Design a protein around this nucleic acid. Structure first.
Lengths: 119, 178, 84, 45, 60
RNA sequence: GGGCUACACACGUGCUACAAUGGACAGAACAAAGGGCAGCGAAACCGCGAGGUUAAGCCAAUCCCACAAAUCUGUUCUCAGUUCGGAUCGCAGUCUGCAACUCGACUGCGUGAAGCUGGAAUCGCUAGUAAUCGCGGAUCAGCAUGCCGCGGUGAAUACGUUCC
């Protein structure tokens, strides 16, 4: 479990079912299915005994789950050892793309708490 | 038994030429594998630790036995009684029927894994390994178990030195990170 | 950036060129941080003009497309009162 | 690929085998082609 | 420093992008409409003075 | 060259959502007003896209910006952190500009925060008003969730001056 992207779900149509794969998104799924000719097909999981394999190969050409996590990880590790400034933003809790800090930007900062008063 | 015949014809003769042996006949041999559960309870009230015990029957056909604690712990449950984890000691033909599933199927299935075990050797002989998923073992169904439980394997080598114990494993086809 | 291409002011170009062909002089200040690192520029160490003080910067093989002035932050950290 | 062993089930389909897995099968490119490209290879004219 | 600023502007910029708009009647930069190159206040006072047709004010 | 964009946090004010009166796809259909020659730039072609190549016409009730969007008609998902929402970030491109690191915009791909309607408290509005959907302009090399306008769809309630 499973034949291609590991741990694809069940009782869902195939396109959203492999969008869950850490790699393929929506439009990429539209492309791999355009190569497939499945036409959707199948709402549940019942494709075909061999077509599941040929799709397994095309998905195999795409790459790849936790190693793709290793791509981003090795990339940011490349972005910290380089000096730096971008990875510096990655670990300050500072947003990296460049969008102030005086308000909001809590996506990294977190909620609580507060430690100031006047007067 | 195919793995069992494999060292009787392929591995041993190659192993014999790699270095000298006293009294010719001598050769390192696998002894026992010990699979640990641990579970971790969290906290004591599983409530059914035995449900985890049933799961290990799938990983290996030998019946698991719960390991009752012989010492109390201030940090976690519990004083003696109410066993934590389980243990298995498969042997004989079961030994290589299980190891054949390990190299051919189990280890490659893991996501991030590519190879391990470098400093892992005791310097004496015994091999050790950690197992963090039931997906690793093909016989288990995905629908069962749900929440993950941990697992262990400890191959034993007859050889008195790790340098011999390691070389025996390499010819078995055991993966190494290198 | 865009295409054709990354843009040094061009004085740094002839400077690092002369420093590469001969002399092998090390540590030089620059005010023009806008210039991108180049493969010919590799291994040099430049004092970067943040404004307040020049910050020396070695160039590893890994850095090229990043801006030369990016590595030195003008900003002073943090500054905050009661840490921990 | 097929393998003759023993189990509670009379038949066992299996998604992955050592003869198919890229690591056990020599050093197949599979999908990588590791290190392409690093740490630098960026030039365009 | 408005004299220095208008002196800065009337002189040709090293780059064409540099030329920000400003009214002649007053040396204040910023908030100057480009189409008429007048101050909002410059155009205000001229509006009470009345420089162009017509109606004036707040129709439609 | 920086900084005016700081960052442990507080507050004011907007935007987007927390979804089946919905999401997504396909087809079909109705605007107003404004801007345009150092400009608008059709059509044809190249690129998945952004845009690019090339170039007709227009000093404009002629031509261009320009396609209206909600809606309607069907297909599909069937109640969940979801085909809900889009954050954050990575990679690869693109427009403007001597030049996009600080500190620009946009696109393709990938990643898929929080949030399942919000305490105390508080604001607007008596009809084409509230509700909501798109468009244009001033600003302007580039940058408009802000501001100023344009039109589409379009209600509920008003017993009354006890009380604020």
């Amino acid at each position: 479990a499973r034949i291609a992207g590991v741990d694809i779900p069940r009782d869902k149509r195939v396109v959203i079912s492999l969008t869950y794969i850490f790699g393929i998104g929506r439009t990429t799924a539209q492309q791999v299915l355009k190569e497939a000719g499945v036409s959707e097909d199948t709402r549940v999981r019942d494709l075909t005994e061999e077509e599941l394999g040929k799709i397994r190969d095309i998905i195999d050409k795409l790459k790849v789950e936790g190693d793709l996590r290793r791509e981003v990880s090795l990339n940011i590790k490349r972005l910290i050892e380089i000096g730096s400034y971008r990875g510096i933003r990655h670990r300050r809790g500072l947003p990296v793309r460049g969008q102030n800090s005086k308000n909001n930007a809590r996506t990294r900062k977190g909620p609580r708490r507060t430690v100031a008063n006047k007067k | 038994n195919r793995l069992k015949e494999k060292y009787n014809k392929e591995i041993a003769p190659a192993l014999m030429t790699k270095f000298n042996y006293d009294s010719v006949m001598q050769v390192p041999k696998i002894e026992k594998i010990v699979i640990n559960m641990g579970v971790g309870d969290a906290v004591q009230n599983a409530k059914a630790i035995d449900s985890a015990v049933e799961e290990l029957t799938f990983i290996a056909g030998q019946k698991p036995v719960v390991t009752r604690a012989k010492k109390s712990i201030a940090g976690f449950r519990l004083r003696e009684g109410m066993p934590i984890g389980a243990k298995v000691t498969l042997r004989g033909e079961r030994m290589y029927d299980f190891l054949d599933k390990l190299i051919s199927v189990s280890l490659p299935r893991v996501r991030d894994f590519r190879g391990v075990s470098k400093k892992s050797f005791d310097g004496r002989g015994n091999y050790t390994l950690g197992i963090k998923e039931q997906l690793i073992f093909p016989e288990i169904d995905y629908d069962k178990v749900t929440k993950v439980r941990g697992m262990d394997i400890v191959i034993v080598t007859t050889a008195n030195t790790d340098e011999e114990a390691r070389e025996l494993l390499t010819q078995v086809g055991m993966p190494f990170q290198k | 950036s865009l295409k054709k291409g990354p843009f040094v002011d061009g004085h740094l170009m002839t400077k690092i060129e002369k420093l590469n062909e001969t002399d092998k002089k090390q540590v030089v200040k620059t005010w023009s941080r806008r210039s991108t690192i180049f493969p010919q520029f590799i291994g040099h160490t430049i004092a970067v003009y943040d404004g307040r003080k020049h910050v020396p910067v070695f160039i590893s093989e890994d850095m090229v497309g990043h801006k030369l002035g990016e590595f030195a932050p003008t900003r002073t950290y943090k500054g905050h009162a009661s840490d921990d | 690929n097929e393998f003759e062993t023993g189990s509670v089930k009379e038949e066992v389909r299996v998604e992955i085998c050592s003869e198919c897995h890229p690591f056990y099968t020599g050093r197949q490119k599979f999908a990588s082609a590791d290190g392409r490209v690093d740490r630098f290879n960026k030039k365009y004219g | 420093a408005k004299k220095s600023m208008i002196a800065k502007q009337q002189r040709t910029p090293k780059f064409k992008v540099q030329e920000y708009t400003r009214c002649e009647r007053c040396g204040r930069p910023h908030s100057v409409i480009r189409k008429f190159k007048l101050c909002r206040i410059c155009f205000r006072e001229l509006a009470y003075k009345g420089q162009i047709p017509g109606v004036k004010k707040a129709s439609w």
